[PDB]
Amino acid sequence: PAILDAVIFCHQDDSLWPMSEPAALKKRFDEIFEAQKYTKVIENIRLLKKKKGDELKILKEREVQDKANKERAEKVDRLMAQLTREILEAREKCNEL
Amino acid sequence: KKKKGDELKILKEREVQDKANKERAEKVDRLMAQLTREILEAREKCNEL
Amino acid sequence: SISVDALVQEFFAQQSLKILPQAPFGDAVNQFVSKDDKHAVEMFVMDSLSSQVRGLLQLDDDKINEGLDSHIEDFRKVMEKNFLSGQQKQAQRRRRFKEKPEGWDSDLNGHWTLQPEAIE
Amino acid sequence: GQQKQAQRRRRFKEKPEGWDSDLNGHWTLQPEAIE
Amino acid sequence: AIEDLGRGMAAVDHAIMQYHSKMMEQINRTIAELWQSTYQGTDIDTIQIRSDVESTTSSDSGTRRNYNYRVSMVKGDTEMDMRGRCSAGQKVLASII
């Protein structure tokens, strides 16, 4: 249809659109090529890329706090482990005495 | 507008440090206050006894 | 003497896509060529990422810790071999997304699509 | 209008070829943009 | 996800570019055949359509694809803008071909 509109059934004085001036000449080829519609798919998927960049950037920093909270937990756990062992030792020792 | 995106990324940055700083300060201050008071009371009671 | 869609699909094999599969990514162009709609490529990419996240979550922590990239392409080959069947697209086609409310601020209130109200 | 003279001396450098603002952050945000 | 959407657009972009160079080639062969066969004018040996593929400006992170078109007349090695002559016959003929 782009060719039908621009090339085939040309308008009377527009018959010389091959000799319309460069910028108008350019507005006319870009129509015929069916190129403007696939420029639109590119720019849509480019916005997909920019929004994807936004999501990862914020999630970047979370891992530091996550791993710090993860790593201190085992230290706390071994602390309670020695605590429980000492509790058992004291319970035995008092009755022994 | 890209700078507004910069704002957006700074927004989440602030809030993570918020809670850590606040909780750390509150818990430590309460702990030192109560423990020091208890130590003083214990020593005084020991001497009185 | 070769159309633009055939010409572009002749390249998809050439580039090695890092994680999202090649042939389904090319098929994502086919819907835009035929139905002249853009949104399905977004549904396609978020469905791809959603399909790989819950596949990765069951995978054991010790090997997320060392060498995770081998498993994600291992899941990729699975994804291409399921693509030839073409059985999961019918469930995808039923769901639709609601229009963004007027005055919505994606910067402050977040993107409309991320909101659960966008899905009807 | 006294502080404007000093600021005019400093200027930004050009973005390196192949720079990715999405990956490496935007080029002007990096401290190396100012000598 | 962010790097591979990037090579995805690189393949979409290299496809619209391959398409553009081949058609320039198709149009140039047909137009040369027609003009060289009809020697009525005797003033111009050949005419070409010079689409500028370097008109595309480089955006900070994007291709921003756009081709600038201007039709020219060739007399030997020299090539002229083809605009400003008074040979209305040449103008209409070139538009037609």
Where would I find the H helices in chain E?
2-37, 88-96
Taking CA atoms, what residue in A is nearest to B11? A58
Check E60 against D22: CB less than 8 A apart. Answer: no
With contacts defined as CB-CB under 8 Å, which chain C residues touch B4? 107
For residue A63, give the chain B residue with the closest CA: B16
Please check whether residue A17 touches E, CB under 8 A. Answer: yes
Phi, psi torsion values for E79, nearest 5 degrees: -135, 130
Amino acid at A55: E
Query: Any idea which residue has 């400093």 for tokens?
Result: D10
Residue B9, chain A, CB below 8 Å: the answer is: yes
Residues E68, A26: C-beta atoms closer than 8 Å:
yes
The reported resolution of this PDB entry, expressed in Å, is: 4.0
C/A Cβ contact: 3+ pairs below 8 Å: yes
Contacts with E28 (C-beta within 8 Å, 6 or more apart), sequence order: E48, E49
Chain A residues whose CB is inside 8 A of the B20 CB are: 65
Q: Is the dihedral of CA E47, E49, E53, E54 positive or negative?
A: positive
Q: Name the residue among A30, A7, A31 with its Cα closest to residue A18.
A: A7
Distance CA E8, CA E6 (A): 5
* Distance between CA atoms of residues D32 and D11, nearest Å: 11
| Residue B40: CB atoms within 10 Å | 10
Using alpha carbons, select from E93, E58, E56, E54 the residue that is nearest to residue E73: E93
B49 and chain A: CB distance < 8 Å anywhere? no
Cβ atoms of C14 and A17 within 8 Å: the answer is no
Structure tokens at C93: 């086609």
Q: What kind of experiment solved this structure?
A: cryo-EM
Give the integer Cα–Cα distance in Å for A35 and E66: 9
Decide if C32 contacts C45 (C-beta within 8 A): no
E20 close to E49: Cβ distance less than 8 angstroms: no
Backbone angles phi, psi at D34, to 5 degrees: -110, 130
Q: Are A58 and B12 in contact (CB under 8 A)?
A: yes
How big is chain B, counted in residues?
A: 49
Q: Does residue E67 belong to the interface with chain A, where contact is any CB pair within 8 Å?
A: yes
